């Protein structure tokens, strides 16, 4: 099978689920195996925060210091002293993997015990946020802090993105700005034909965790939604994009 292939040309291991929701049909491959979500979680987190507030609200400025500043803060560095509006906060979150942004998005909402309140509030027994950036980024495999699976993360980014948690207006936010990327060229886009839209986010973290979730369109009908997730057994184990590409093709084919 292609994604055993994978498994042992990247040493490394696979977590894959993807839906087509035109047709209920799913691809699976330890689909509901844990993995620390790593960034991932920073779409769901917008999307929390997206129900919580109306986008005219979005418009709130936050002032930060440097306290709050951790790493990859590429966009929060640069407006210490401006601040920033929560909408700018959620831009650079999906579409930078600004850390900082993420970690101010979340203490807006109540911090990670809050946001796995409204997680399983919305039908999520799986996903499990505990901890701030940098420390979520550190899970020892067979602990559960922050860890979902990909089953559970497209169930997730579906519901907010594609169904009923949110209304059309903010839907179209979610979407415009995971559309809009910068941080997934060689991994879930690198594995669907040019012309077909994709909006993502991606996550890295420590045993080599390489994520990509995903929604991807057809030219035309219903979209697939998608979670590659990737680990491997050394705490230090560098990630291979390709791997998350390469099973992107693999999923594609298989709904195809
Ligand atoms: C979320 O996944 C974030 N990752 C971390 O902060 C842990 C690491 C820092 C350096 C290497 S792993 C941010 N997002 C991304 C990404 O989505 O690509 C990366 C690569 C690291 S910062």
């Known amino acids: 099978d292609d994604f055993a292939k994978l498994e042992e040309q990247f040493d490394a291991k696979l977590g894959i689920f993807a839906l087509d929701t035109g047709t209920n049909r799913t691809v699976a491959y330890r689909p509901d195996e ?20 109306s986008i005219e609200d979005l418009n709130q400025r936050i002032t930060y210091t440097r306290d709050d500043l951790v ?13 920033m509006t929560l909408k700018e906060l959620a ?3 999906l579409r930078y993997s600004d850390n900082a942004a993420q970690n101010l998005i979340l203490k807006q909402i109540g911090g990670p015990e809050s ?3 409204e997680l399983r509030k919305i039908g999520d027994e799986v996903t499990n946020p505990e901890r701030f950036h940098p420390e979520l980024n550190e899970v020892n495999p067979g602990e559960t802090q922050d860890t979902s699976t990909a089953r559970a ?17 903010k839907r179209e936010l979610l979407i415009d700005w995971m ?4 941080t997934g060229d060689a991994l879930i886009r690198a594995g669907v034909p040019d012309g077909w839209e994709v909006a993502d986010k991606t996550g890295a973290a420590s045993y080599g965790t390489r994520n990509d979730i995903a929604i991807i369109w057809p030219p035309k009908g219903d979209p697939v ?16 994009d390709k791997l998350i590409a390469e099973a992107t093709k693999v999923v594609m084919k298989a709904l195809n």
């Open 34 to 53: 844990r993995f620390a979500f790593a960034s991932t979680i920073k779409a769901l987190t917008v999307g929390v925060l997206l129900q919580q507030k």
């Open 71 to 83: 790493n990859y803060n590429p966009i929060t560095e640069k407006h210490v002293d401006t601040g």
């Open 91 to 93: 831009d650079a979150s």
């Open 115 to 117: 946001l796995k309140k």
């Open 153 to 169: 993360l497209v169930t997730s980014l579906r519901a907010f993105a594609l169904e009923d948690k949110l209304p059309s207006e």
């Open 179 to 182: 559309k809009r990327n910068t």
């Open 225 to 240: 939604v998608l979670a590659v997730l990737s680990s491997r057994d050394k705490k230090d184990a560098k990630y291979d």
